[PDB]
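Reminder to self: keep the SMILES exactly as supplied, no canonicalising. Ligand is equilenin.
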Amino acid sequence: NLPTAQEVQGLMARFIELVDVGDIEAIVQMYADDATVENPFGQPPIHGREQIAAFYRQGLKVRACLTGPVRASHNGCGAMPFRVEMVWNGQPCALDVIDVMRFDEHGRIQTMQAYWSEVNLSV
Amino acid sequence: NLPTAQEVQGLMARFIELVDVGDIEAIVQMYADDATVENPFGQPPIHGREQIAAFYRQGLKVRACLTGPVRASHNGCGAMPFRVEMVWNGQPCALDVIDVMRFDEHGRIQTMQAYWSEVNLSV
Ligand SMILES: C[C@]12CCc3c(ccc4cc(O)ccc34)[C@@H]1CCC2=O
Ligand SMILES: C[C@]12CCc3c(ccc4cc(O)ccc34)[C@@H]1CCC2=O
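Structure tokens returned for the bound complex:
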């Protein structure tokens, strides 16, 4: 059913772990089949598991970690701060992001909005 | 005009400083006259400076501090992680929150959503 605040904290924490290890198939399965992703917030959203999978395969030697607790509400939504470290054309980079997610009645990610821009990038 | 990503970072950081010192009038002036506030996200929103001022006067010996960088987008929005420490009936408490704000063309807060619940409270 619609995840409780405690369940949202668990789901979002699991999401980061999956991103960290890079299990693309497991990441995609956490999304609803018709989920929408806005990354970064402000740019046109991608829709559906096919587009989401393509996005992650292209994006993910990457490391991800929570940098603070998951903030969860009682209506199936949560927000979390985390950092992503990768390599861009050789040089190591870090990106600080905040994701806001809305889950559906099946415990799957319905909508995801990623807040970040160049000001949160470090090379 | 619509604040740039760098400007959003500055405005949101200033907001926390105002909350920390507790300057109610200065806090209210950062909001648009008809701004809406959802605190915590999930509960009915309050509307207008009068209601917002009443909310802050009731809410603010409180300390507030950013616990990570402000994540800003290019369309006048930002998200930030912070902690609020206060006293509840004698016992000291801490609350971890994430605010998402949308600014208008005048650089004022149009909409604010605060993500938190009992799971983010520490007594
Ligand atoms: C999509 C994402 C936010 C942005 C992002 C991720 C991973 C690799 C990236 C590589 C980039 O060059 C730019 C942005 C990202 C995260 C994976 C989990 C998440 O929330
Ligand atoms: C409104 C707020 C989030 C919640 C909150 C604040 C201040 C005092 C509080 C006292 C409470 O007993 C419960 C919640 C708050 C913050 C002031 C700045 C902000 O974003």
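Points to follow up:
The first helix of chain A runs from residue 5 to 21.
The first strand of chain A starts at residue 31 and ends at 38.
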